[PDB]
């Protein structure tokens, strides 16, 4: 599978008529471009090296699009104040996710378009790219407006055409970075917990991409319930970290084993506490 996404946010500012607008593009979940209206010169910037392959026209055309997006979010934000009878002053947020998924057959699996107001679902284009799902009463106003105007045809055309085309291009252009892995470096630590009981923590560090599985085992059986699993976190260098711990009887640590699964591992790792 492969994917492209643009995640946009406009934030209403107390005392200012222009919203803060930020747009981030991802290919396969990796940021590749970025626009921020607060920057000194507001323009789209490469965020992955394989994007330097684009000439000045690209960044010019992308930047122009963003100034159009700025105004669209500004007006829409103003409209939402009416729909919810919201006071002047205040800060409010409007967000947009759009893009496409490609299948194993590199064909368009699905297109996406969603909006949220105040961090909550507002309206979404359904998988058919014809209908709209409104989450509440105010979004029904927007749904009905957009049915009456043929909004969906415009978005549909972007999602099946331009999105797909450039995704193929980026996948070709950034192939050697995007399709790489970094397999985890893994070890087990041992810590005090309580009277006659210890924690065994299984670390996996420096890995890419983010998807990974850590499991613990005693006597041949999984410990799904009984294990603590942190949320996967960026190391700061493009790689990620995760760990999984279990609370264990003191003296019975060797009976416990940890397994790590990752795309960069042909055969999964088996780890054990080593005194």
């Amino acid at each position: 599978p492969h994917s492209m996404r643009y995640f946009e946010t406009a934030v209403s500012r107390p005392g200012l008529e222009e919203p803060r607008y930020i747009s981030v593009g991802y290919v396969d979940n990796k940021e590749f471009v970025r626009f921020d209206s607060d920057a000194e010169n507001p323009r789209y910037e490469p965020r992955a090296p394989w994007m330097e392959q684009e000439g000045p026209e690209y960044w010019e055309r992308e930047t122009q699009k963003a100034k159009g997006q700025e105004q669209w979010f500004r007006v829409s934000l103003r409209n939402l104040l009416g729909y919810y009878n919201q006071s002047a002053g205040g800060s409010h947020t409007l967000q947009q996710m759009s893009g496409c998924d490609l299948g194993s057959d590199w064909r368009l699996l699905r297109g996406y378009l969603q909006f949220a107001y105040e961090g909550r679902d507002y309206i979404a284009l359904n998988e058919d790219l014809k209908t709209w799902t409104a989450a509440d009463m105010a979004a029904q106003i927007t749904r009905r407006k957009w049915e009456q105007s043929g909004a969906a045809e415009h978005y549909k055309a972007y999602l099946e055409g331009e999105c797909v085309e450039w995704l193929h291009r980026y996948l070709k252009n950034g192939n050697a970075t995007l399709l790489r892995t970094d397999s985890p470096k893994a070890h087990v630590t041992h810590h005090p917990r309580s009277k006659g009981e210890v924690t065994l923590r299984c670390w996996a560090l420096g890995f890419y991409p983010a998807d990974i599985t850590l499991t613990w085992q005693l006597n041949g059986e999984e410990l799904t319930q009984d294990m603590e699993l942190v949320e996967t976190r960026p190391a700061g260098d493009g790689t990620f970290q995760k760990w999984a711990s279990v609370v264990v009887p003191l003296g019975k640590e060797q009976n416990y084993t940890c397994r790590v699964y990752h795309e960069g591992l042909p055969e999964p790792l088996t780890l054990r506490w080593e005194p």
Binding site: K65, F115, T142, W146, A151
Partner: peptide
């Protein structure tokens, strides 16, 4: 390549 929104607002 980013999307330009349809000219109908929310």
């Amino acid at each position: 390549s980013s999307l330009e929104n349809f000219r109908a607002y929310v």
